[PDB]
Design goal:
InterPro entries: AB_hydrolase_fold, LYPA1-2/EST-like, PLipase/COase/thioEstase. GO terms for molecular function: hydrolase activity. Its EC number is 3.1.1.-. Helices cover about 30% and strands about 20% of the residues. By secondary structure, it is of the alpha/beta class. About 40% of the residues are buried. A 7-stranded mixed sheet has the order 1-3-2-4-5-6-7, sandwiched between helices. The protein has a single domain, classed as Alpha/Beta hydrolase fold, catalytic domain (Rossmann fold, 3-Layer(aba) Sandwich), CATH 3.40.50.1820. The protein has 6 helices and 7 strands. The chain is globular, with a radius of gyration of 16 Å.
């Protein structure tokens, strides 16, 4: 149960919550808060430390696959036993509930972390608030496809991805978005031309607008 995390308590009473996950790609998004145009009067921010994201995931992925990978027998070296990390998030969610309504918590993820936000919410036994997949592919889709919960089929999902990403190519973001679409989870797919493996300013605006349009503030 050991974990560290940065916690931002809102100015007014906490009514909402955003769990922001990060893994090379373990960028410090703690500052991201000052980049938004939405009222953070009632929004608690949870930034778990990168230990919540095991290293053993993107290793096989970005050690075996071709430099110009396009699709996913690579399944042999991806640590599905993810799960633990998911549970961690679950605990965190279970911790915010018994403190904030589960449908008022949003799971956002970037790159390595973006995996543990989607998979969690779509297997979450309870009603969550949203998913913000950013520059993230959908690994071990075979292992997690059956464990999906229809309880969140239709929750606000935002997928974002860079066009010139050579670390995590765009067709994999299309892969996540599409594999969520046919799964029963509709989502906005927003790709950014020129952008690589990062987060830009237009994207920050769109993220802000997502939190605004989901927390209905």
């Amino acid at each position: 149960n050991a974990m560290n995390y940065e916690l931002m308590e809102p100015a007014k009473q906490a009514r909402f919550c955003v769990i922001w996950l990060h893994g090379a790609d373990g960028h410090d998004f703690v500052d991201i808060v000052n980049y938004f145009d939405v009222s953070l009067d009632e929004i608690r921010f949870i930034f778990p430390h990168a230990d919540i994201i095991p290293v053993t995931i993107n290793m096989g992925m970005q050690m075996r696959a071709w430099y110009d990978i396009k699709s996913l027998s690579l399944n042999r070296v991806v640590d599905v036993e993810i799960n633990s990390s998911i549970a961690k998030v679950n605990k965190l969610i279970d911790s915010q509930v018994n403190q904030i309504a589960s449908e008022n918590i949003i799971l956002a993820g970037f790159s390595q972390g973006g995996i543990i936000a989607t998979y969690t919410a779509i297997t979450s036994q309870r009603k969550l608030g949203g998913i913000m997949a950013l520059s993230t592919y959908l690994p071990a889709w075979d292992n997690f496809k059956g464990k999906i919960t229809s309880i969140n089929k239709g929750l606000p999902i935002l997928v974002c991805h860079g066009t010139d990403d050579q670390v995590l190519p765009e067709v994999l973001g299309h892969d996540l978005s599409d594999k969520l679409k046919v799964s029963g989870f509709a989502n906005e797919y927003k790709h950014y031309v020129g952008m690589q493996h990062s987060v830009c300013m237009e994207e920050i605006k769109d993220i802000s607008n997502f939190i605004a349009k989901t927390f209905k503030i």
